[PDB]
Ligand binder design. Structure first.
Ligand SMILES: *[C@@H]1O[C@H](CO)[C@@H](O)[C@H](O)[C@H]1NC(C)=O
Lengths: 213, 219, 12
């Protein structure tokens, strides 16, 4: 099988900048290379066929070049909507194979998260478990800290985080931190707090509530 | 318009078989080949095989033994079957079509079928409201739905039947120590619209046929 | 990097 090596594995750039994707083949393959774009939750989308040929409905800012073993996909002036993974594919030799891909991330200005906290629902407490959620919304860069405190006792090991991929419009991330307690434990305490640390905030921001309204 | 629509997400017991249907439209199966490509954590994009216009098949070398592709031209259906799945066969499976009948530049793709190889049993999620209060900042309110304790992935979440998309964030699911998945989906809306407007998350978990609409209100 | 089936993107 032909090995295709894509470089680098990850690219960070600002809008309006030029970006090049490299795809190197383990042996010559002429111009028998195709490029794809893959967005979050999406299928691959055909960008370029045969090293350099255009595809219907693909923006003119996408182009490709190269022959032999060294291929390049170019985006002359990146837009926020271009966030995706980019793959190359060779079909000079059976079976057709794909590269491991390059991840395209976009730079933007620092954005502080807007923070929101959600008590467990009465509906959930009926099942003996209490989930407390903290939302960090529309922030950048990706690095953030959430600290849970229950009656001033620092929480550890009982929370999980999920982070969205970059937003296609504003390039920001959002994050959910879920604190998970037994109903019994939840009922034995009053003040549930979520302290958020981020480069966009000059000081940590705390959101909290007292159990039982 | 060319479309390839695949069957729903599935759970497969280890050493058992995977079956997926590709239903196509906008072209005839007698004029184009249909390819199958999968995408896994361990091997990325991997071409599996193809059924051509005239019904011949090719299978990628490591799948010759366990793979078989068939079709029904008249019903516009392609049938993909793979035998004796192991954990590292867990992946998203795609059907695709090339620009021309004989080629391999895949211009059109199925939406993908996420396949989980696991001994665990299907379990539908519970849906809890993430209710706004004063969740209020600068006149903006946030609300959501907690979709908890299901298996396997995925779940789909929309708001107001697709009508509300602006401000929506559905988080990647995380696997809990109980071996079940959990996720939240949130949306920011104007504080003042909580009186007039209804907000409903539409949760769908196809592997368990759990289909739930949750009305989320201030408390 | 590798594709993540939960996020449906590469994860690095
Ligand atoms: C899965 O396991 C087999 C060995 O049982 C191995 O040869 C193959 O490369 C693996 N496939 C992956 C990592 O998807």
């Amino acid at each position: 099988d032909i090995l295709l090596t894509q470089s680098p594995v990850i690219l960070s750039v600002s809008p309006g900048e030029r970006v090049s994707f490299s795809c190197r083949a383990s042996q010559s393959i002429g111009t028998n290379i195709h490029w794809y774009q893959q967005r979050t939750n999406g299928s691959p989308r055909l960008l370029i066929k045969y090293a350099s040929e255009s595809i219907s409905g693909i923006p003119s800012r996408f182009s490709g070049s190269g022959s032999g073993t060294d291929f390049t996909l170019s985006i002359n002036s990146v837009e926020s909507e271009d966030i995706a993974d980019y793959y190359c594919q060779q079909n000079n030799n059976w079976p057709t194979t794909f590269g491991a891909g390059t991840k395209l991330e976009l730079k933007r200005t620092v954005a502080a998260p807007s923070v929101f906290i959600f008590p467990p629902s009465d509906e959930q407490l009926k099942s003996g478990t209490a989930s407390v959620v903290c939302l960090l919304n529309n922030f950048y860069p990706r690095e953030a800290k959430v600290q849970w405190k229950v009656d001033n006792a620092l929480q550890s090991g009982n929370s999980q985080e999920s982070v969205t991929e970059q937003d296609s419009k504003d390039s920001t991330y959002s994050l959910s931190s879920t604190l998970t307690l037994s109903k019994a434990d939840y009922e034995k305490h009053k003040v549930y707090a979520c302290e958020v640390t981020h480069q966009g905030l000059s000081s940590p921001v705390t959101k909290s509530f007292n159990r039982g309204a | 318009q060319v479309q390839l629509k695949q069957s729903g997400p599935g759970l497969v017991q280890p050493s058992q078989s995977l079956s997926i249907t590709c239903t196509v439209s906008g072209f005839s199966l007698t004029n184009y080949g249909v390819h199958w490509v999968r995408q896994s954590p361990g091997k990325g994009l991997e071409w599996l095989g193809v059924i051509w216009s005239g019904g011949n098949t090719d299978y990628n070398t490591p799948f010759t033994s366990r793979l078989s592709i068939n079709k029904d031209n008249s019903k516009s259906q392609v049938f993909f079957k793979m035998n004796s799945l192991q954990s590292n066969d867990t992946a998203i499976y795609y059907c695709a079509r090339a620009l021309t009948y004989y080629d391999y530049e895949f211009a059109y793709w199925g939406q993908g079928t996420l396949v989980t190889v696991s001994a665990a049993s299907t379990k539908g999620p519970s849906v809890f409201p993430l209710a706004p209060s004063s969740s209020t900042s600068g006149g903006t309110a946030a609300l959501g739905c907690l979709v908890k304790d299901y298996f396997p992935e995925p779940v789909t979440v929309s708001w107001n039947s697709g009508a509300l998309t602006s401000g929506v964030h559905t988080f990647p699911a995380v696997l809990q120590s109980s071996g079940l998945y959990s996720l939240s989906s949130v949306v920011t809306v104007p504080s003042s619209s909580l009186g007039t407007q209804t907000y409903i998350c539409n949760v769908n978990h196809k592997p368990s046929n759990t289909k739930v609409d949750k009305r989320v209100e201030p408390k | 990097c590798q594709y993540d089936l939960s996020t449906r993107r590469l994860k690095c």
